Amino acid sequence: MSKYQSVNPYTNEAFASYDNPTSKQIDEAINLAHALYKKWRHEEPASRAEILHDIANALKEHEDELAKMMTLEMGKLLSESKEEVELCVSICNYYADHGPEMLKPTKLNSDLGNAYYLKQSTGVIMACEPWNFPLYQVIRVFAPNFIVGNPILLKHAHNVPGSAALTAKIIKRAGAPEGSLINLYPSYDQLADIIADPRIQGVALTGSERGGSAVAEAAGKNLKKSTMELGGNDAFIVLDDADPQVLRNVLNDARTYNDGQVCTSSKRIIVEKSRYDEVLHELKNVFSNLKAGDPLEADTTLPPMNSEKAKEKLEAQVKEAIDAGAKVFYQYPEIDSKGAFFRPTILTDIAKDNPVFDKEVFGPIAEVFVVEDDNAAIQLANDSSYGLGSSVIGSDIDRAKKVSAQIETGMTVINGRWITSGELPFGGIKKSGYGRELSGLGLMAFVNEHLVIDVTKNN
Amino acid sequence: MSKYQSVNPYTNEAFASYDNPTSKQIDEAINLAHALYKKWRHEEPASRAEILHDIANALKEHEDELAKMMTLEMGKLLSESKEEVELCVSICNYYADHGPEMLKPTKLNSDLGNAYYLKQSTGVIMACEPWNFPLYQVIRVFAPNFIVGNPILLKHAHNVPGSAALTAKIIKRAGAPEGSLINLYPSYDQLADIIADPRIQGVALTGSERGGSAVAEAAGKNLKKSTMELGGNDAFIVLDDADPQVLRNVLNDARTYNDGQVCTSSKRIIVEKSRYDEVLHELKNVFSNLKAGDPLEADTTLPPMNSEKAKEKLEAQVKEAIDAGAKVFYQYPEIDSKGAFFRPTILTDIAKDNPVFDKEVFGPIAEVFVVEDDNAAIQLANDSSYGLGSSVIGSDIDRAKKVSAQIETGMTVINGRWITSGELPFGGIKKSGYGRELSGLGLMAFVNEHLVIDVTKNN
Structure with a gap:
């Protein structure tokens, strides 16, 4: 049934298995995330910056535990797992320190009236991530969107369910309100259904061409904006x-x-x-x-x-x-x-x-x-x-x-x-995907650039 | 067979019918456009600015002919058709005057090395447009992408084939190299096949939810970046x-x-x-x-x-x-x-x-x-x-x-x-679509933000 399982590649022995959620659990998660999205609309990005910094500190605090879980689930050298945690602490601090500033309204030069556009949130984002950089792939999407105000539902690779759960737990306990990042173990069909829910307004994926195609096809069918970070x-x-x-x-x-x-x-x-x-x-x-x-x-x-x-x-x-x-x-x-x-x-x-x-x-x-x-x-x-x-x-x-x-x-x-x-854009072209994560570009991936123009003068 | 036909809504009488192209004609078009994309990679955006200004002048020169064709095919008041042409002349001049400038490389602040990103073309774009603003919908996508260096294959609404053909002809004769904007009358199946061709690297659509879903689903399946301007x-x-x-x-x-x-x-x-x-x-x-x-x-x-x-x-x-x-x-x-x-x-x-x-x-x-x-x-x-x-x-x-x-x-x-x-972003959220056309945002829709970083110092 569920393909979600922790198997140590060094000993080739499984040590934990996880079930797909029930329809009820999925609905509850979407409900929590959507409710959070609405609440965040009335709270400035700066109000989440402090929490993101605390998350950065919590990641550092749990570095050895996080690194070990990664290494146990997908075999990465512990030294590399720790480097990944350090990179993530840096990314979190980056957006905590520069995110709110990059979300200030932008004035537009137009003789048609007093114009400017606001950089607003859009809604719950369905994030699908791979096993190769279990923490970084998640943080790459979470950090900027947390600041923007886009809650995230996470579907991590079937082989890093333990690292996924641990990451979500640390982030919640650090201060991120329930709904900010909810880890789920959905089947492909459940994933497709989630993408079709109107409360989901963005789809972000990093992974294979095979997985990408299926997920991108679903996002398209449902007319949801997406970013694809492939091979x-x-x-x-x-x-x-x-x-x-x-x-x-x-x-x-x-x-x-x-x-x-x-x-x-x-x-x-x-x-x-x-x-x-x-x-x-x-x-x-x-x-x-x-x-x-x-x-x-x-x-x-x-x-x-x-x-x-x-x-x-x-x-x-x-x-x-x-x-x-x-x-x-x-x-x-x-x-x-x-x-x-x-x-x-x-x-x-x-x-x-x-x-x-x-x-x-x-x-x-x-x-x-x-x-x-x-x-x-x-x-x-x-x-x-x-x-x-x-x-x-x-x-x-x-x-x-x-x-x-x-x-x-x-x-x-x-x-x-x-x-x-954090300050460098990451993304490709052709079969490698589209859209960019990190830097100011990734920050704007699921942002609603809301144009506001006062044309009173001409009417 | 082909649904492409000109029918005057005022007299409810058809006056022209157009066939779907052959597989050979489609391949020839893609080949021409892709070849142009490669050639443009070695020619600065400023080199196309002059031509875009000439296109702007040609549109003005053919204003009454273009307006009449629009009104004859989809019933718009002639006065509104002319206003649309004027708007398009303005948009063309806007990108001719501001496009190249907005494509200059952007320096990135990083202690990791000397970084910056280039704004490069990506390839042939499959543009699908609606009958309500037959010229503006086309120009909205053509103008910026012409400057960027992305050739455009156009599939216009089945009921404005005459306006579509006329627009493409005027633009070519004005100076746009063959392949810059090729009008085609593909069936839905042919459209899907075009989107699946590796030489096509972007899909832009303005229209209905129904049409959008199908086209966006195909773009996703083929992992092609897309913009959706819906209702x-x-x-x-x-x-x-x-x-x-x-x-x-x-x-x-x-x-x-x-x-x-x-x-x-x-x-x-x-x-x-x-x-x-x-x-x-x-x-x-x-x-x-x-x-x-x-x-x-x-x-x-x-x-x-x-x-x-x-x-x-x-x-x-x-x-x-x-x-x-x-x-x-x-x-x-x-x-x-x-x-x-x-x-x-x-x-x-x-x-x-x-x-x-x-x-x-x-x-x-x-x-x-x-x-x-x-x-x-x-x-x-x-x-x-x-x-x-x-x-x-x-x-x-x-x-x-x-x-x-x-x-x-x-x-x-x-x-x-x-x-x-031209200076104002146009786009929505939810079922209205994603991505933005016009302004600097639309200009970057199908641009490859190519990061280049010199890290010699650390190695």
Whole structure:
């Protein structure tokens, strides 16, 4: 029945299962959230800023508990889980400190009358999030919308129900009124019904193309505004003038952070010929020195994939890639464990007709391509159905900026791998989705820009 | 087969029919538009500003021809058709003069590195427009996107194929490269297929809830960003301190402009008790003095509805409303004509349980409600599934601004009826849709805010 279950990927053992709610429980949740939305309409955003700061403090206070729950449910290295909490504390403080200020009415220049638009709330938002960054994905949507005054109903990934519940509890106890963030374990059908309720006025999703399509289709059918933060197959472009040290530092985790289970992981490493062998050698150095083990242990640098099912899907993708012509430049040694460990692998010679060429590969799989010049790098970078993030490594900044501009993608980091922060917009184009989260753009995602114009003079 | 046909609502006679394109013609159009999108990526927005100004001039040059075609296809008073052309000339000049400037890169304040985001094009946009403002609906989307560099494929309403073709021709001949705006007569199935093509990266629609749902559902399924400009059932709030003269001037066309076939028509006139009888009297004065006739003739002030089918649907809505309890305070005399004329009517006593209470009525039908005070006005105004525009008539501006803020809608005009201009955002909430057209917001609808951050310092 319910697919919501906590299964430790390191021991491959389940430790908790959760049921789908009843129709009554769902209605009660929507009722509470909608009631809160109405109440918030009469309370300034600044009035919630203090509470958001307290939430930031509560997250810090529960950092080790939150990190452990994450690591237990989806295998992330504890160190990375803690970094995620720190990032979330920062995001909460960011919106607590800058949100209300960015919601002040905006004056419009018009000779038609005295005009301006207010930035108002819209209603309850149905947030659907993935298992890869269980806290950050939630906070990315919660923080700004809490300030705006949009209550959130959360449907988290089926495999992080414990982290989802814990997050919601901490936030409520920190001071967020009941209804601010309600965690629910709905079936796909229940989710569809919730989206069809008139009290729901926004749909935000981060996840897979498959899940995205279904949810976005439902939002559309019901004419609800939506934001889609999907996967990516980011081009990591290494120019011939890349600084050897910068390149080395970045390759340390450009593809292996969170075991490569990152939408902005540097999946397609595009190297200009003179640096091809150099990049391959460095990747092999990085990969070969990883250490598999309990993600809760400090010496572990290679965690298991989030689930045995995820490991198996990856094995299938890689096999299909190899059977189509991809070559194995390197593969980590066999790992003796009942855990969902996948061996870091470096693939080369992936042709345009290879099934994996335009497919997002979630896992520790470096995909290296060799190109002749800048134009070829850009052409290959854009020969993609995706467009989330990207990177350009080169010492000549002017050159790097010029190349960056030509990449059809939502974000580009010069001399660094993926990055995220409260002040920076996050989002993509094409199959990677639409809309932006974080920064002022994400803050306005579900805001009603209410135009008010006094035209008394002309009537 | 094809539903695309020109039928004069005044004579109720068809004068032209158009076929759906072949698969080959559709592919050729998408190919041309996509090719143009790629070429434009290397040409600054300013390079298209001159052409947009020339387009503005061409529209002015063809004003009488364009106005006549509109009036012949959907019955609008020629004077209103000309006003629409003037509005479009203004919008084109607006984006030609302010578009490129609003597309300059935006610097972001971050200690993480030197950050900024570019405002880039995204691709071909599938624009679906309605018959009520045949030129304005097209220009509203074309102007800003032309500057941005997003080619447009247009699917106009089945009943304005001649106006659609003429508009596209004038724009091309004015200087817009082939592919900038291609008019097509696709069937619903062909439309769905176009939306599923990877070269299409945005879907913009203005029209009905029915059409919107289907198109928005398809956009979602295909994960394409979309904007929905749907109907409204705007609250026209008359406060007890409304200036008698302002009120009179505004009621002259608050409900009868374009025969009430306006999404922002003042459909729900909510009057505080002390001014109830006054408003009813004025509406009767306005309605009774209208003159039915050929919309091409200067003395005609009451045009026919856009189609016989539209007239019949309205008769059915009104009958249902009356059979449920709505009362006829006034009804224009019978009109002897084979044309699609509907008699202006004033309805009162529409209860919450009346089928028409929360239904958009396109036509010359004033719906008057009486309320006790400001709170009751706001409560009734928000007791709606819609939220496009609104109006608040009152001499005390501070009071009017306070009431305006409490209305759950996208725009509110103080002491005036609906308004639109290049610098003003147009859009709603709830069933009225999402996203905004015109102003800087509409300009960014299908823009890729491409974040670029140089983090060399930290690596």
